[PDB]
Amino acid sequence: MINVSGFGTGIVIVSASSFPMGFSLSKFADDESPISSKELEPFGYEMLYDGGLFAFDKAAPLEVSVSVIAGSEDDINLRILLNSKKGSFRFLPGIIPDMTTLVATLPDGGRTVLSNGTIIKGPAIDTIQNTGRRKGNTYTFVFGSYLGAQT
Amino acid sequence: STSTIRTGTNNDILLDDNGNMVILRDVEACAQDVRAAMLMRTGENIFDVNSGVGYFEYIFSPQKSYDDARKSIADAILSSPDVTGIEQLDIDITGEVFGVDAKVITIH
Amino acid sequence: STSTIRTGTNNDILLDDNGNMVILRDVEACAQDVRAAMLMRTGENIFDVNSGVGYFEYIFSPQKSYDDARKSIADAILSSPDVTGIEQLDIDITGEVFGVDAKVITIH
Amino acid sequence: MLGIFTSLLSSRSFSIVDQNTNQLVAADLRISRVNTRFSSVGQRHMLEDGKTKMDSRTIHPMEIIVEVFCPSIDVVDQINQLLLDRDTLYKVITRGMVFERMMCTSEALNQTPDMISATPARLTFSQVLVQNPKPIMFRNAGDSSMIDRGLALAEDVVGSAGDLFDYAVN
């Protein structure tokens, strides 16, 4: 019996400049997937002219996306993160607001330390569905480090 | 117009019934010349050295690909006069037989 | 055709049994010359200076990238006569060992 | 293509053999495509009446372009040495198609985020045209054809006849 539940998952987002101390996402959305990541592709294959195969490394981003309930404090914080131009901060050899998301998945203790990244896209305004209930807001980040997973 | 002394399978001048030497010409002479030129190991001609088939470095050796063997056989066949080209060539390898078949298109 | 006096692992002139100097030629001479060239620190030639391996600026120093060390070793190997190139140059790093392995393809 | 039944499950396709010393070079290249393009030019000559005589044909040198992946730094350095190697003619055996007297004309290495371990490369060789593709040699050292050197302009020393004598005595 493997417990693959999702209740109790928490996220801590710490940004270099906008949120130096960071905020916490706990109020995840109900209609969209609370966390969704694209299929990572850190390798590639090519065909030799004699039928062989060659394997090499490629550059792979982590396109993560977190969904939150419209109007919540987490949504307000994520919108503040989104509406922060990269041109209004100091340059360091690191990434312009290098924000990291510490993901504590379930009380078992699985900690993911996705870092060296930034937010890419998200909804600026709340969209009202046909049914009359505001749609959950999915904000996408991209990252350049997927290492730090525990248990 | 090729013309060569007639020889048998033992590759010696084999005379006719009247004890004369026959000089084959055109197709028969070209065929005899091709058969003779395909049986000569390289480095046997003191005046060419590089001519001949590589029966010891291109065939009869533990090699990776027999492309060099095919190239050497084709060059040896083309070296004969009035051969122009080769229509078809097999490099078939049986269990222990290096079967070669040619389809010389000599002009005559 | 390179030639060099016989030297031991102490890099000194090693004589033979009859008290003569041995003059190695070709393969062994080139190997000994390459080994001697890889042991010469940069700036040790009054008459070359820029020649020599970077044992104190590329190796033995907190260098970020060992590509410069690889290039210096490659230049030192190629400086010997009749070396042509290097087939393989491994620059493996152990805990505190800078393991270098070469596969010179000297013409001999 | 067919023509040869190797009946062997480990036959190597590509081979760049140094013509002298008969040695493989850059044996770790991962070839991807090979274009062995020939070339020749006609001599179209319009003449009087509506007509054009092509005259004869001159065979321009062969060009061969090899796209490849170099997996290692020593292979890349071997490719650089091939480009910088001005004193040897190579022989390229792609697929049952042997080309002798082949010299590297061009090379382009590409380093991209699409491939961080290996490096794509585009080698280009051109054939060296020779008057006699099949030369005539001789086995023994006595019987060369004579080589002329033309006028020499004999240079000078100061040694006197005494030194030449003493040398001949010794």
- The answer to whether the CB atoms of D74 and C85 lie below 8 A apart is no
Distance CA C95, CA A107 (A): 39
Distance CA D163, CA D46 (A): 73
DSSP state of A136: P
Distance CA B7, CA B22 (A): 9
- The answer to whether the CB atoms of A48 and D117 lie below 8 A apart is no
How near does any CA of chain D get to the CA of A109, in Å? 34
- Kindly give the interhelix angle for B27-37 and B67-79, rounded to the nearest 10 degrees: 140
* Contacts by A86-89, CB closer than 8 A, 24 or more apart: A86/A118, A89/A16, A89/A17
Contacts of B85 (CB under 8 A, 6+ apart): B78, B105
Distance CA D90, CA D78 (A): 13
Q: Which of C66, C87, C103 to mutate to test the interface with D (most CBs of D within 10 A)?
A: C87
On whether the CB atoms of residues C90 and C99 are closer than 8 A, the answer is yes
Q: Residue D19 — left, alpha, or beta (φ > 0 → left; ψ -120 to 50 → alpha)? A: alpha
Which residue of D lies nearest to B76 if distances are taken between CA atoms? D134
- The answer to whether the CB atoms of A59 and D114 lie below 8 A apart is yes
Cβ of residue D114 closer than 8 Å to a chain A Cβ = yes
Nearest to A58 among D14, D71, D116 (CB): D116
DSSP state of A126: P
Q: How far is CA D130 from CA A111, D17, D20, D133, D148, in A?
A: 70, 19, 17, 6, 21
Cβ of residue D137 closer than 8 Å to a chain B Cβ = yes
Residues of chain D positioned with their CB less than 8 A from the CB of A44: 114-115
Distance CA C2, CA C60 (A): 32
Distance CA C47, CA D4 (A): 59
* Residue A128 bridge partners (DSSP): A134
Helices (H) and strands (E) counted in chain B, each on its own, are 2, 4
Tokens at C89, concatenated: 């140059």
How near does any CA of chain D get to the CA of A72, in Å? 39
Q: Which of D1, D7, D95 to mutate to test the interface with B (most CBs of B within 10 A)?
A: D7
3-state secondary structure at position A47: strand
Distance CA C96, CA C90 (A): 16
Subunits adjacent to chain A (3 or more Cβ pairs under 8 Å): D
Tokens at C1, concatenated: 């055709």
* Strand (E) or helix (H) holding B75: helix B67-79
Q: Which of D34, D94, D116, D123 to mutate to test the interface with A (most CBs of A within 10 A)?
A: D116
3-state secondary structure at position A4: coil
On whether the CB atoms of residues D90 and D143 are closer than 8 A, the answer is no
Q: How far is CA B39 from CA B12, B23, B33, B51, B97, in A?
A: 13, 21, 10, 12, 16
- DSSP track, chain D: --S-----TT----EEEETTTTEE-STT-EEEEEEEE--EEE--EE-SSS-EE---EEEPPPEEEEEEEE-SHHHHHHHHHHHH--S--EEEESSS-EEEEEEEEE--B--BTTBSSSEEEEEEEEE---S-SS----SSTT-PPPPP-----------HHHHHHHHHH-
* Residue D104 bridge partners (DSSP): D125
Resolution (angstroms) stands at 3.3
Pick from A50, A38, A65, A74: which is nearest to A122 by CA? A65
Cβ of residue A53 closer than 8 Å to a chain D Cβ = no
Contacts of A20 (CB under 8 A, 6+ apart): A14
Distance CA A25, CA A11 (A): 5
- The answer to whether the CB atoms of C87 and D78 lie below 8 A apart is yes
On whether the CB atoms of residues C13 and C5 are closer than 8 A, the answer is yes
Tokens at A89, concatenated: 């901060």
Tokens at D68, concatenated: 């490849």
Contacts of A33 (CB under 8 A, 6+ apart): A65, A67
Residues of chain D positioned with their CB less than 8 A from the CB of C105: 23
On whether the CB atoms of residues A122 and A21 are closer than 8 A, the answer is no
Tokens at A101, concatenated: 């998301």
Tokens at D137, concatenated: 């040699």
Using CB atoms and an 8 Å cut-off, which of residues 50-79 of chain D contact chain C? 73-74, 77-78
**A43 phi and psi angles, rounded to 5 deg:** -135, 165
Residues of chain A positioned with their CB less than 8 A from the CB of D33: 49
On whether the CB atoms of residues A68 and A74 are closer than 8 A, the answer is yes
Subunits adjacent to chain C (3 or more Cβ pairs under 8 Å): D
Distance CA D91, CA D100 (A): 4
